[PDB]
Structures are given as structure tokens and as C-alpha cells.
Amino acid sequence: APKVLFTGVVDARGERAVLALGGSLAGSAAEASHLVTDRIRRTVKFLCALGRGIPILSLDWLHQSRKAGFFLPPDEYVVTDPEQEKNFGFSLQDALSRARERRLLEGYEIYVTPGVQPPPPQMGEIISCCGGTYLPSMPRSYKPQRVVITCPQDFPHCSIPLRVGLPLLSPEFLLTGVLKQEAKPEAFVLSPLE
Secondary structure (H helix, E strand, O other): OOEEEEOOOOOHHHHHHHHHOOOEEOOOOOOOOEEEOOOOOOOHHHHHHHHHOOOEEOOHHHHHHHHHOOOOOOHHHEOOOHHHHHHHOOOHHHHHHHHHHOOOOOOOEEEEOOOOOOOHHHHHHHHHHOOOEEOOOOOOOOOOOEEEEOOHHHHHHOHHHHHHOOOEEOOHHHHHHHHHOOOOHHHOEOOOOO
């Protein structure tokens, strides 16, 4: 039975269809089997669903399923948003295919300093949904794929990662990388002395 999550929309009729058909309403994207929405948006729920490779479907999926009397396959209902695909420069279908082949952040260990925006806990949810490790405190040693997402306010606290050669990165490394399902840390390095 599906555990359906909604994002960027309000659809009481859709929620009712999920339950009527035997499914349940997902508490979060990490728990969801399907995400229902109307557009591509950079939200914790959308980015987590995409990172996990679950179906991201239109609101018509549930309404047509209710008419059928059972959950229909996802294929004919994938969210299509050429406009936002143009705004962001990526293909949702291609990004999902990538997520379905591999977790984007497999092997990555990421510490997000306290002052970063968006909020560290939201960044960690996204990191975890992409198979990475959200670190509890600043690292003390170098390791490949171990990085620190930080910000100007926190540069004063970055002497240890700089000492050991850990990259200081922009939060967009995560947001843009997860949206496109393409991790390019070298392209988001911050300049702490500027």
C-alpha cells in the first residue's frame, strides 16, 4: 500500500483518495513511496523525494485511480514542468533515473555550520535522503568526500577544516546538486578570507 506525500499544493480530495484506496498519508519524504505535486520546486519534500528516486506524480494520478478503484501505475502521471526545467536547466526524468541508479551522496560526510541558510536540519534531511551522512559536529580530519557547508557568519569557526584541507562549500552545492542529481563540490568552494 502506498504512503503518499504532498508538497507545494493543497489537495484534500487527493488525500481522501489515498485513504479510500487503502494507502496512507506519509509523514515525510523519507517515509513516502510517492510524492504528489503540481510543479518542480526546490523544497525539502521535493528534493528528498527526488533524491530517493520515488515517483513524483501529478494530482491526476489519485483522481484517476479513485475512478479506477485501485492505484494506477505511475508512468502516465509523472510531473511535467518544462518551464521550471528551463529555469533550472535539468530534466526531472533524467534526474530521477540517476537517483534510481545510485544515491547521489553515497560516501559523502557533510557538516553544515550553524549559521547556514537554509537551516542545517533541513539540509541534513536532504543529505540523508540522498544517502549521505549529516555530521553531528565539525570534523577534525581529512577524508575524501568529507565537506563542510558553511557561510560568512561561520568563517571564524573554520580554522580546523581549513587546517586539514576539507572543502568549505556553499549551501547551493546541496540544493542545486540534489535538484540536478549531479554533485559538483569543486564548483561551490567559498572564499573565507574575502
